[PDB]
Amino acid sequence: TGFQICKNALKLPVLEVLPGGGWDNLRNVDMGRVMDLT
Amino acid sequence: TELALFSRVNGKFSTEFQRMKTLQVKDQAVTTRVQVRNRIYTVKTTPTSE
C-alpha cells in the first residue's frame, strides 16, 4: 500500500491529487480515505 | 538724488536696498507593506488512530 517501491523502480513523482477520499459537503474539506489505494 | 547749484556745487546721493529671501520645504513619506502566506500541506489524523 506504499509507493516507495514504485518510486525506487521508476524515479518518478506520484500524482498528488488522488480521489476516493470522502468530502464533507457542509464545510467543504476532505475528511477520510474510503477507497483502498495500493 | 542729484543737486547742482550755481553749476558749480554738485551733490549726489545714491542709496540701494536689495532684500532677497528664499524658503524651501520638502516632505516625503513612503510606506510599504508585504504580506506573504504560503500554505503547503494539510495534515489530518486518520480516523483509525489510537
Swiss-Prot record, chain B:
<feature type="transmembrane region" description="Beta stranded; Name=TMH1">
    <location>
        <begin position="11"/>
        <end position="16"/>
    </location>
</feature>
<protein>
    <recommendedName>
        <fullName>Macrophage-expressed gene 1 protein</fullName>
    </recommendedName>
</protein>
<comment type="subunit">
    <text>Homooligomer; predominantly forms a homooligomeric arc-shaped pore complex instead of complete rings of 16 subunits.</text>
</comment>
<comment type="similarity">
    <text>Belongs to the MPEG1 family.</text>
</comment>
<comment type="function">
    <text>Pore-forming protein involved in both innate and adaptive immunity. Plays a central role in antigen cross-presentation in dendritic cells by forming a pore in antigen-containing compartments, thereby promoting delivery of antigens for cross-presentation. Also involved in innate immune response following bacterial infection; shows antibacterial activity against a wide spectrum of Gram-positive, Gram-negative and acid-fast bacteria.</text>
</comment>
